[PDB]
Amino acid sequence: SREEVESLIQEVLEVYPEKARKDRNKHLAVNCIISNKKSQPGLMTIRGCAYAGSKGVVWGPIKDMIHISHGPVGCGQYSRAGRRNYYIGTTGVNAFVTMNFTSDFQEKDIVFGGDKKLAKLIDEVETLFPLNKGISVQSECPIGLIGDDIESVSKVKGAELSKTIVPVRCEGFRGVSQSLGHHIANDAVRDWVLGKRDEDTTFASTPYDVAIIGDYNIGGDAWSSRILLEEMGLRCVAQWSGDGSISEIELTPKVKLNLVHCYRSMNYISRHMEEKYGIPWMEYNFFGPTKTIESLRAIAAKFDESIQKKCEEVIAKYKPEWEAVVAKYRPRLEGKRVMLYIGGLRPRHVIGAYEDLGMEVVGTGYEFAHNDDYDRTMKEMGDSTLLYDDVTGYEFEEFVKRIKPDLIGSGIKEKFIFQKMGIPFREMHSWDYSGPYHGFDGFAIFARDMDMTLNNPCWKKLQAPWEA
Amino acid sequence: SREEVESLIQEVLEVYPEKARKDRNKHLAVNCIISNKKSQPGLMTIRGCAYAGSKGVVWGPIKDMIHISHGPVGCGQYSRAGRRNYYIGTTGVNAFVTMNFTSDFQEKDIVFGGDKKLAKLIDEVETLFPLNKGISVQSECPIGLIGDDIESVSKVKGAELSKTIVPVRCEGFRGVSQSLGHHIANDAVRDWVLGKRDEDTTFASTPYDVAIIGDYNIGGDAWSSRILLEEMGLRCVAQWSGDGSISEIELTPKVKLNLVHCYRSMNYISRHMEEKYGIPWMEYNFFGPTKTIESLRAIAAKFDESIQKKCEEVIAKYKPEWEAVVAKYRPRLEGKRVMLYIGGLRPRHVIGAYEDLGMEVVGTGYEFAHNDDYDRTMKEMGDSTLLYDDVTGYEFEEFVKRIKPDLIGSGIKEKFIFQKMGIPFREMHSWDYSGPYHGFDGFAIFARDMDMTLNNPCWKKLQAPWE
Amino acid sequence: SQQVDKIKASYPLFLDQDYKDMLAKKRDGFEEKYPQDKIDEVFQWTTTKEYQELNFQREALTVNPAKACQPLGAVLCALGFEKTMPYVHGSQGCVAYFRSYFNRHFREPVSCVSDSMTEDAAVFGGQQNMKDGLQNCKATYKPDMIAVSTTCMAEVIGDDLNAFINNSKKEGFIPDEFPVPFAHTPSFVGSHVTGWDNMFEGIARYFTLKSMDDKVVGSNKKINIVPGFETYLGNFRVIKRMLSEMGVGYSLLSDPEEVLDTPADGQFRMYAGGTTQEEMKDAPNALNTVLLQPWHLEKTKKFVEGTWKHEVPKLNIPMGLDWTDEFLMKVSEISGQPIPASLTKERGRLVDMMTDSHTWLHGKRFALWGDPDFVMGLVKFLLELGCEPVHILCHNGNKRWKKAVDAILAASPYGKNATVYIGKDLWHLRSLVFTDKPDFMIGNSYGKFIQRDTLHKGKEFEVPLIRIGFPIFDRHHLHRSTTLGYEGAMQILTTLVNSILERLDEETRGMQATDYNHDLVR
Amino acid sequence: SQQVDKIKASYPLFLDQDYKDMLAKKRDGFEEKYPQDKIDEVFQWTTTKEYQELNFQREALTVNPAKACQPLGAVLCALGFEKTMPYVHGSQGCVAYFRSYFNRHFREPVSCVSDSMTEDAAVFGGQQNMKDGLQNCKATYKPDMIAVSTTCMAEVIGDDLNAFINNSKKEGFIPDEFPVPFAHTPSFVGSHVTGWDNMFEGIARYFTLKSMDDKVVGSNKKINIVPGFETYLGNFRVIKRMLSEMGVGYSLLSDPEEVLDTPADGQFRMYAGGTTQEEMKDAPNALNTVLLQPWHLEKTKKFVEGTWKHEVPKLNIPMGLDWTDEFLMKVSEISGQPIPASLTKERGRLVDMMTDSHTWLHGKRFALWGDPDFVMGLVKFLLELGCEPVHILCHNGNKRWKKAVDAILAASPYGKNATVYIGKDLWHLRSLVFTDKPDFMIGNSYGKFIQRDTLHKGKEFEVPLIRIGFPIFDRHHLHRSTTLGYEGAMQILTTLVNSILERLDEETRGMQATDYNHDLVR
Ligand code: CFM
Numbered sequence A: 001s002r003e004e005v006e007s008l009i010q011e012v013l014e015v016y017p018e019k020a021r022k023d024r025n026k027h028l029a030v031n032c033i034i035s036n037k038k039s040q041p042g043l044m045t046i047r048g049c050a051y052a053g054s055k056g057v058v059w060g061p062i063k064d065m066i067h068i069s070h071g072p073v074g075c076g077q078y079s080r081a082g083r084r085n086y087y088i089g090t091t092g093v094n095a096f097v098t099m100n101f102t103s104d105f106q107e108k109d110i111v112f113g114g115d116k117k118l119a120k121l122i123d124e125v126e127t128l129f130p131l132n133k134g135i136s137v138q139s140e141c142p143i144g145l146i147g148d149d150i151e152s153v154s155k156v157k158g159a160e161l162s163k164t165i166v167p168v169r170c171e172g173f174r175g176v177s178q179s180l181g182h183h184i185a186n187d188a189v190r191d192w193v194l195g196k197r198d199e200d201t202t203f204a205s206t207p208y209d210v211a212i213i214g215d216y217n218i219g220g221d222a223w224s225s226r227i228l229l230e231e232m233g234l235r236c237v238a239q240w241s242g243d244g245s246i247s248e249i250e251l252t253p254k255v256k257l258n259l260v261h262c263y264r265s266m267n268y269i270s271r272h273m274e275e276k277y278g279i280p281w282m283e284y285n286f287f288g289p290t291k292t293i294e295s296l297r298a299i300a301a302k303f304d305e306s307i308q309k310k311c312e313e314v315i316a317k318y319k320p321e322w323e324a325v326v327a328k329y330r331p332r333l334e335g336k337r338v339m340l341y342i343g344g345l346r347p348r349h350v351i352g353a354y355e356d357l358g359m360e361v362v363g364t365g366y367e368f369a370h371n372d373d374y375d376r377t378m379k380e381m382g383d384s385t386l387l388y389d390d391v392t393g394y395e396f397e398e399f400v401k402r403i404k405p406d407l408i409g410s411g412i413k414e415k416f417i418f419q420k421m422g423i424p425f426r427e428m429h430s431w432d433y434s435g436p437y438h439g440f441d442g443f444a445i446f447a448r449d450m451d452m453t454l455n456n457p458c459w460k461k462l463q464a465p466w467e468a
Numbered sequence B: 001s002r003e004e005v006e007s008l009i010q011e012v013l014e015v016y017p018e019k020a021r022k023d024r025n026k027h028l029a030v031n032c033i034i035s036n037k038k039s040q041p042g043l044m045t046i047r048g049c050a051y052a053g054s055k056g057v058v059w060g061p062i063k064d065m066i067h068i069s070h071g072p073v074g075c076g077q078y079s080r081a082g083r084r085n086y087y088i089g090t091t092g093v094n095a096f097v098t099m100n101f102t103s104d105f106q107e108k109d110i111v112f113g114g115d116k117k118l119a120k121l122i123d124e125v126e127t128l129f130p131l132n133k134g135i136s137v138q139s140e141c142p143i144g145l146i147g148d149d150i151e152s153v154s155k156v157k158g159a160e161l162s163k164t165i166v167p168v169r170c171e172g173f174r175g176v177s178q179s180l181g182h183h184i185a186n187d188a189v190r191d192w193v194l195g196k197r198d199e200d201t202t203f204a205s206t207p208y209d210v211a212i213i214g215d216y217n218i219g220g221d222a223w224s225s226r227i228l229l230e231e232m233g234l235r236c237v238a239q240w241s242g243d244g245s246i247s248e249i250e251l252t253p254k255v256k257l258n259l260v261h262c263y264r265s266m267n268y269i270s271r272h273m274e275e276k277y278g279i280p281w282m283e284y285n286f287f288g289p290t291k292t293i294e295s296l297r298a299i300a301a302k303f304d305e306s307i308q309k310k311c312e313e314v315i316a317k318y319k320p321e322w323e324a325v326v327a328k329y330r331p332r333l334e335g336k337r338v339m340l341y342i343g344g345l346r347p348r349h350v351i352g353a354y355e356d357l358g359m360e361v362v363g364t365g366y367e368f369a370h371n372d373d374y375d376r377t378m379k380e381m382g383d384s385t386l387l388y389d390d391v392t393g394y395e396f397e398e399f400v401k402r403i404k405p406d407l408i409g410s411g412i413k414e415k416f417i418f419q420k421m422g423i424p425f426r427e428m429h430s431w432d433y434s435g436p437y438h439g440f441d442g443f444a445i446f447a448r449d450m451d452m453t454l455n456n457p458c459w460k461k462l463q464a465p466w467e
Numbered sequence C, D: 001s002q003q004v005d006k007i008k009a010s011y012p013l014f015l016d017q018d019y020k021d022m023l024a025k026k027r028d029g030f031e032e033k034y035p036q037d038k039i040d041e042v043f044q045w046t047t048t049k050e051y052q053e054l055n056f057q058r059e060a061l062t063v064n065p066a067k068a069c070q071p072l073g074a075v076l077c078a079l080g081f082e083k084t085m086p087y088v089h090g091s092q093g094c095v096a097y098f099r100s101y102f103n104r105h106f107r108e109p110v111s112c113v114s115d116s117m118t119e120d121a122a123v124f125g126g127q128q129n130m131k132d133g134l135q136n137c138k139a140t141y142k143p144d145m146i147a148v149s150t151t152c153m154a155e156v157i158g159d160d161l162n163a164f165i166n167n168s169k170k171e172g173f174i175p176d177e178f179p180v181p182f183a184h185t186p187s188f189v190g191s192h193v194t195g196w197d198n199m200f201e202g203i204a205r206y207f208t209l210k211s212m213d214d215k216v217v218g219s220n221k222k223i224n225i226v227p228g229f230e231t232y233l234g235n236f237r238v239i240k241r242m243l244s245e246m247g248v249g250y251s252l253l254s255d256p257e258e259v260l261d262t263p264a265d266g267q268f269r270m271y272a273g274g275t276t277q278e279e280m281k282d283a284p285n286a287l288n289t290v291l292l293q294p295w296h297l298e299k300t301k302k303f304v305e306g307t308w309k310h311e312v313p314k315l316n317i318p319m320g321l322d323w324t325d326e327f328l329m330k331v332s333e334i335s336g337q338p339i340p341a342s343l344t345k346e347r348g349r350l351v352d353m354m355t356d357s358h359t360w361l362h363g364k365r366f367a368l369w370g371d372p373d374f375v376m377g378l379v380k381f382l383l384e385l386g387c388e389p390v391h392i393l394c395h396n397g398n399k400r401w402k403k404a405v406d407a408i409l410a411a412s413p414y415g416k417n418a419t420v421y422i423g424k425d426l427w428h429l430r431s432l433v434f435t436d437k438p439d440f441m442i443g444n445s446y447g448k449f450i451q452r453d454t455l456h457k458g459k460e461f462e463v464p465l466i467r468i469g470f471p472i473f474d475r476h477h478l479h480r481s482t483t484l485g486y487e488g489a490m491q492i493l494t495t496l497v498n499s500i501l502e503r504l505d506e507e508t509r510g511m512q513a514t515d516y517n518h519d520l521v522r
C-alpha cells in the first residue's frame, strides 16, 4: 500500500537522466497524474502513431470502402490484417478490409509529389474494384512534409466520379500517439461522410433506433454486444467501424441515441452529433456480467416500460449461462492478481469482468489516455494500486518484478517478455486470437481464456530440476 | 554379348559353395533353363510364399467377401494394402479389400488348435459385417502343421449360416514360391464357389459374353482393359479378382470365351472351365499399342462380322492418341536398355511396350515362373540377352554392374539398391504408385513414367564435384 | 482416352464419363451389389454405440491390428550390429515380407536372408537348411556375423536352433569362431517388440555369458544405452548427441542409423556402421546400462542385471519434458558428468515453445496408438501440453503397463477423460472416434482409413490423422524425425499446434461464410 | 448462448442461428449491399484473363505488396550485434510496427527504440531528439552499442545523422568513444533488404575505415560470413555448423540467433550473443568475406572490396544442391580445409531423398514469391527436383536480377514455362494463379488470402499455399526451420513431397467415389 508503491516508483526513476526522470515521475501515480504528452526519446514507448489511430483503428474496419495507405510501403504493410476487426463480406470484390492498398512512394514521388499518382491510382481502384462504395486516403509521414494537397485530389476526382473520397491527414508525426489519429479520423468522417443524408427523409426511424459508436468488433465483439441490444427490443442502425458500412455511418444521423463504448476514440463525433442533430449519447460497458447488466438497464431506462421489461427478461435469459461460467471459473481464479496495460478504454473497462471472477487488478495504465479517462479509471481501481501513463519498457518490467502479478494483460510487444519471466500473459488487444470478450457470450470465452492461461501446466516448468 | 554373358555367369557363380554353384548354374541362361525348383538356403531369394499367392494375389482382390488371414498376426499385417488391386466399394460395409481380418493366433491356439476360435470369429464376422457375401480362410504356416481341419469348420458353419465359406490351405511352407498358392487358390475356387450356379438357367447369356481371367486391376489395369473390349461390342461378365465380386465368379460358367491375361496364376481354372463347361480360353497381351492391337484383332476373330468391325473402329479411334504418345516419348527413350526381374507374367509381357518406345530389354527373369512361361519368353527376347530364374540378390547386383542397363524394372526390395548405384528404377509390380499400364490409356502413363525416371535430372548429380 | 499433354493416372482417369458409365454397367449387370440405401444404413449403424457394444465383445476376430510379429523386431535388432546379416530360420515368405515392410518405411534396402524351409523340413526338421544356409550366406554376402531368428513354422516343429548351429560348426559349414547368435522368435507370442528383446538378449548372452570372470563393472567408465525397437533415425541420433554434449562415454548397443541411411553416391553399401562385436564383449565393464524403452526389454533387463550385474535405473522412455529431465539427471549421476549449459538452454527453449503455443493446444482431445513405450511418452507429453489423451490404445500392451499409464493419467487434471485399452485394435478405435469424437488421432498410416470413415459420416465428424509412429508409408522421409529428448518434443509440439491451425484454416476458408475468423496472425 | 462445458469462440459461435439471423437483418436494412448475384459476377470477372490484362497495367496502385520498408531491415541487422540497441531516429509509430512485425514471426521479444520526433521537429530538425535520445537509451537499457537508422520523416526533412551524433558526443550526452554507427534508411528507396545492406555497411565502416593501416588481408585466417536479411534461425545455425565441421575459422557478422531464441527460464534477457565489436574491428584481417545473400548486399560488397581489399567470391546463395556444393568448395579453397566425410555423406543423403521422391515431384507446377536471393535459390532447387517454377514474383527484384534468373531458367527444360516478375505484387499473382493455375504456391502467410480466393472459385481451382518465406504469422515455430545447405534442401524437399501427398489424400478420401486411389503406400 502507498509507501511500498511510492518507494517502488522513486527507485525505478533513479535510472533516468534528470530531464527524463522529472517528466516520467509526473506520469506514474498511486491512487495526481498527467497524460497525453510527448514520449521521452530513447525510452522504448509502447505507443504507435496518428496513422495507426486513423487507418489502423477508425477507418480500416469500414468494409465496403477502399482505404489507401498513401506514402512509402512500410506502414500499410505492417498494419495489413494486424487488428482483428471482423466483418462479413466477399473480400476483394465487395469488402476490402484485409487488403493493403498503397501508393508505394519511391524517390520521384517525394521529390515531385504524389498528387498526380494519387489521381492515377484512384482511376485504377475504380477500374479493378468497381463495387467499392468510397475511398479514403490515409496520409503517412511524407505527404504533409512534402507539401501535397490530397484535398484537391479528393474533391476533384470525387466530383469527376460521383464517389466519396475522404482525404485524411493522419501523418504519423502529428500528435503524440494514436490518439490524435482518432480525432483527425472523427473530423474526416464529419466533413466528408456524415452529412451526406442530411436532406433525406427516406429512412423510417422508430423510437428504438440506436447506434453502437466505437466497437471495432475485435473477434466479433460488436456482434455479441448487438444481439443483446436487439433481444432487449432496440434496433441497431449502425456499428461504427466494426463490420461497418458507409451507409450505416450515413444513417447514424437518424438514430435516437448513440451508444458509446469507446469513449476515447469516438467521443468527438458523438458530441458533434448531439450539437448538429440533437442526438444524445451515453457511455456503457459490456465487459463482464455485472457491467453488461448495469449497462442494459441504463440504456433501457432511457427508453420506457416495454424495453425495461425486455431488459429484465434478457437478464433472466442469461443468468443461467453467466452464473454457470462464474461457478466453473471463479474458484480457479479467486484472488489472483492482474496487472494491465492497453490503449485508451480497456485498461479501466475490463476491471469489473476480472472482479466477477474474483481477481484483483493491482496495476493498470494506458498508452494514450487523456485526463478525463483517468478520472474515470480512479473510480474503478482499488485504493493504493499502481497507475502508469505511457509506461516505458524498463518501468513495466521493474514494476512487474516487484508487484509479482499472477497474470498480465497487455499487447504483443509485451507478451513474450513476461512469458519468459514465468508470468501468465493474455493479449488484451487481439484477445490472443480468441474472443469475443464482450457481452455474456464474450464473458464465457474471456473466463475460459484467463483460466487456461493462468492455470496452464507450462508455468510450473520454467526451472530446470538440476538447478533447483 | 554371346560369351561375355556366359563368362559373366560363371564369374558370378564362383563365389558359391559347390552345391549352390551347381544348382544356380541351371537357373541362369543366355537366350536351356530349369525353373520352379526350391531356393537354395541363405542366398536372399526375392520370392514370397504360397500365402502371398493365395491371399495376397488371388482371393484378397475379391471385393465383397471377407478373407481371414488365419494364424499369427504377421502374415496378414505385412500384406495389408500392399498390392494395389483396385476396387469400387464402401470399405467396412459392403467391400473389405484393404482391411486385415485375422485370427491372431496366440500360444493356446497353437497348443490346442484354432478351429473353435475359427467358428467363433465366423459368428463375429457375421454380426459385425452383415453385408459380406462369403468368407475365405487363408491358412498361414501353423494351421497345417498344427493339424486343424478348417474344411470341417467351413462345411459346418457354411451349412448353419447358409454362407459360402472357402477353406484355403495355402500355408507358406507349401511349394517353393507363391506359384503353388495360385494353384491352391484356383482349386479352392473350383471346389467351393464356381459350381454354385450350375442348375441356373436364369442368366440371359448373349453370344458376346467374355470374362477377363487373371487381371488383378493393379492401379486400374483391368478397367482400362474392360473399356476396350466393351467398345468392341463384347460383354464382360466377370473380372477375375481385380474389382471382382463373388457373383461375377459364380456367373463366369455362362460365358462364351475366357480371356487369359495372367497365364501363370490362372491357367489352372481356365483348363477346368474348358473341361467341365466346354468354355474355350485364349491368351492375350494388353501392354503397349502393338500387343493391344493384335490381341483385340485375335479376340475379335473369335466372333462374328460385327465384332470384327467394332474392333477396327476401336483401333482407328485410339490410333491418334497412342501415336501422339510414341511421338512425344520414343525420341526420349530410343535405344535405352532395360533389365527386368518380376514374378510370373510381366517379365515377358511388357517387352512389346518397351519396344514400342524404341527400348530394348537386355535381361529379364522371373521369381516363380515354370518352363511353359520360359517357352513363351524365348519368343520375345533377343539372342544373347540374359535370362535368370529365381535370381539371388548377389547375382542381380553383379549382372547389373556388368551390363549397366539404363533402366531397371523390378520390385520394392530391389528399388533402393539400384537407385543408390545411380540406375533409374521403376517398380514393375506396384507401378510405383502410378498406372494403369494396361490398354491404350495405360500406355500413355507407362511412357510418361519410364521417361520421367530414366531422364530425371537427379541421376546426373550422384557424384560430388570434389569426389 | 488420354490427351498427351495432360496424361491422367488412375485418379482422375476413372472419373471420366465413359469409365464412370462402364463401372456402373459392371455393378448393375454382374456384381449383385447391395442397394446404396442398405449400405448407408449399415454405415450409420457401424458409427453407433450399439455397434460399438458388439464390436467390443469380440473374442476371436481381430480386425486391423496395431502390432506385427516377433521376427520383424529381431531383424531390426540384428541390423544395428556391424556388418551382420539377419537370418530367419524357417519359411522364406516371411523374409520377403519383413524386408518389404521396412523398405516401405525407410525407403532404403533392408538386407535379410532365410534358409528356405519347405514341406519336407516340416516332417524332418530344418537342420540341413541351417547347415547350407549359414555356409551360403557367409560365402555370398560376407557378413562378419549372422544373427539367427525364427519363423512360426520352425517354431511349431520345435527346431533346436542351438543344436543345429553347433552341428553346422561341427561339420565345418561355418568356422567355429564365426559369431552366430540366435533367438527363438515365435510370431504367436507377444509381438515385434518381443522379437527385438529376444534377439538382443540372444546377442548379449552370446558375446558375454561365458566370459564374465574378468569383467569389472565400471572400468571402461561408459554407460550402455539399449534403444529397443526404434524406427526414427532422429532418435538414435539425438540420444548420441545429448550424451556427447554431456561428455559422457557411452555404448549404443544396436545402432542401425547408418545402414538405414546410406548416401546415393553411385554405390550400394549392404552393411554400414552398427555396434561392433568388441563393444558387445566390453559392455559388462560399463558403469551401468540404461534401457531407453523398458516395457519391451524385460528379458534384456533380467540378463543385464542377473549376469552383467548392472543396476538398471528405473527410467521411463526419454520423451517429453519431465522424462528427458529425469534421463539427463540419472546420466549425470551415473557418470559424474554435469548437465551442460547447452542442454539447459535447449530445455528452456522447449519450455518457451510451450508458453507460446499453449492457447491452441489447451484441451485438444486426442486418440492415439502405438507400441507401449512410445504411447506412454506421448501420453505424458500431451498432459504436459495441457491436452487430453482421451483414447489411448496399445494392442500389444500388457496389464501392468495399463496400470502404469492409468497412474500417469490419475496424476493430472487432463487425464480425467482418458481410457487406456490393451489387446484392442484399430477397428475398435474406429468405434471410439465416432462415439466419443476427439479432435485428432496420432498414429501410423493405417489411421488414414479411419479418417476416411469419419469423413464419410460428414465433415463435422472427420477426425484428422497426425502421422507419428510406425509404419508411415504414405508420406516421404518422416522416418528422419525425432520423438525423443527436447528435440523430439519440439518437433511433436510443432506438428500438433500446426495440425490444429491447418484444420482451423480449412474450416475458416469459406468466402463470406466462415472466413471472418480466417486470421493472418494466430 | 453458450454451453459452460462447450464454449464456442467466434468460430463457431456466429454460425448459431440467432447470430445468423441477426447478421442477416443488419445487412439487409442498413448495409445497402450490392446483390449476391452481382458479387458473384464481379468475382468471376476478377478471375479472368480480361481482368488480368487491366491489373497488369497498374502504374500507380499497389495492392497486397510483397516487401516492407528499409528501417525494418536495419533493425534486424542491428539486433545481430553484441549487446546492441537498434535505434530508429524519426517518429515512434514506425518502431511500434517494426517490433510487432518481428514479434509475430519469431514469437520473441524484439527490442528497438525511437527518439520520438513530432510535428515540432519537422520545422526545426531532430538534433535535441538525438541528444536526449541516445543519453536516455544508454542509461535506461544499458547497451554497449546503439546502431542508428531513420524513418521517412527524418529522411524527408534531411537530418544529418553524422552531425547529430557528433554533436551529442561533443555536448556530452554520450561518451566520445561509445559506439554509435549509423546509416540513412529511406523507406521510399528499395525495401527492407536495402535497409539491412545500409546498416551493415554503416557498422562495418564505423569499425574499420580509420584503422586500415594495421590490417593484413588473411592474417587472422578466418573467412567472414555476412548473412543478409535472414528470418530462419536454422539458416544462421546451419552455416555455422557446416563451417565448424569443416574446421574453417569464420566470423559471422551480424548474428541474431541467440537474441531471437532465448530460453523461458524465469528471466527475460534483452540482449544475448551477437557479433562482438572486436570481430568487426578484426574483420579486415580475414582471408576473404563471403556474402550469403549477394543480391541485397551491393553496398556492403563495394565497401568490403574497395576498403578491406577482399576479392569477394562470386557465389550464389547456398540453396539447392549445386549452390551448396559451389559454396563448400569455394570455402575449401580459401581455408585450405578439405570438405569432410560427414558433409560428403550428407550431400549423398540429400541426393538419395531426391531419387526416392522424384516421381511425385516431377513436373509439379509452382507459383512463388519472396526476396531476390531466396526466390532464385528456390527456383534453382525446384528445377533440380524436376519441378516447374511457373510464376516467379519478386516485388523488390531488379532488372539485372531478372536477367540472372531468366538465365537459370534457360538452362533447364523445366524452366521453359516459367516467367519472372519484378515490381509486381500479390494481387497480380492472384490473377496468375487463376489464369495459369499452378499446383501450389510457395510463399509467406499473405498467400492464404489467395488460396481462399481460388477455393471460392471451386475446389478444383484451389491452389494450396506451402509456407516458406517471411513473414509466417499463422503457423507456429516455422522460424526455426532451415532453407540453406543440404539440411535446408532436405527440409524443403520433404515439405514439397508431403504437401503434394496430403493434397492427393484429401482428393481421394471420397468413399466409393475417389478412394480407389487412397493408397496406404505412396
Ligand atoms: S490500443 Fe482501446 S482505445 Fe483504441 S487497437 Fe486498445 S484499448 Fe487501440 S478500445 Fe480500441 S480496439 Fe484497440 S485494443 Fe478504443 S479504439 S486505438 Mo489496441
Ligand code: CFM
Pocket: B053, B057, B083, B178, B216, B218, B262, B264, B265, B342, B343, B344, B345, B346, B347, B428, B429, B430
Ligand atoms: S509378382 Fe504377375 S504372376 Fe502374379 S503380385 Fe507380378 S509378375 Fe505377382 S501378373 Fe500378377 S499382379 Fe503381381 S506384380 Fe500374374 S498375378 S503373383 Mo507382383
Ligand code: CLF
Pocket: A049, A050, A051, A052, A071, A072, A073, A074, A075, A139, A140, A141, A170, A171, A172, A173, D069, D070, D071, D091, D092, D093, D094, D095, D097, D150, D151, D152, D153, D187
Ligand atoms: S509514424 Fe506512422 S507508421 Fe511511421 S512512417 Fe509515419 S505514418 Fe507510418 Fe512507414 S514507410 Fe516505414 S513504417 Fe515508418 S519508415 Fe516510413
Ligand code: CLF
Pocket: B049, B050, B051, B052, B072, B073, B074, B075, B076, B139, B140, B141, B170, B171, B172, B173, C069, C070, C071, C091, C092, C093, C094, C095, C097, C150, C151, C152, C153, C187
Ligand atoms: S511363409 Fe507370418 S510373417 Fe512368418 S513368422 Fe509367422 S506370422 Fe510372422 Fe507365408 S504363411 Fe506367413 S508369410 Fe511366412 S508365416 Fe508362413
Ligand SMILES: [Ca+2]
Pocket: B416, C106, C107, C108, D352, D353, D356
Ligand atoms: Ca532412401
Ligand SMILES: [Ca+2]
Pocket: A416, C352, C353, C356, D106, D107, D108
Ligand atoms: Ca518465444
